[PDB]
């Protein structure tokens, strides 16, 4: 639904980097170099950010509004 704030394994703050990762995607940066520049050395945060699906907008498209 929405990017979690904390990582499951370690607990590093990752929710604040979701918009930055989306910006890097809109840019020419690839997944690997984008996650490397975001400062995620360990693979847990890389997986957290890469395997995450963005459904909040898909649900808001159905929200009452």
């Amino acid at each position: 639904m929405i990017i979690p704030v904390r990582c499951f394994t370690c607990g590093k703050i990752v929710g604040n980097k979701w918009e930055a990762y989306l910006g890097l995607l809109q840019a020419e940066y690839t997944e690997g170099d984008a996650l490397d520049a975001l400062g995620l050395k360990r693979y847990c945060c890389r997986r957290m950010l890469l395997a995450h699906v963005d459904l909040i907008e898909k649900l808001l498209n159905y929200a009452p509004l």
């Binding site: 929405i2 704030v5 703050i13 929710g15 604040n16 979701w18 918009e19 907008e57």
Partner: protein, 49 residues
């Protein structure tokens, strides 16, 4: 109130559409406003969505 005709991007279509942690306002209790100076009690990253 002021946006483009299409405004396909939510950033331009709506305002405050992403509730970041920076919107949190610390409400002092008793003498906490005098004990802690302004700007100390705040979210750490200030950018958590």
């Amino acid at each position: 109130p002021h946006a483009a005709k299409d405004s396909s991007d939510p950033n331009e279509l709506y305002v405050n559409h992403k509730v970041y942690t920076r919107h949190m306002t610390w409400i002092p209790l008793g003498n906490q406003a005098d004990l802690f100076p302004e700007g100390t009690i705040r979210p750490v990253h200030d950018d958590i969505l």
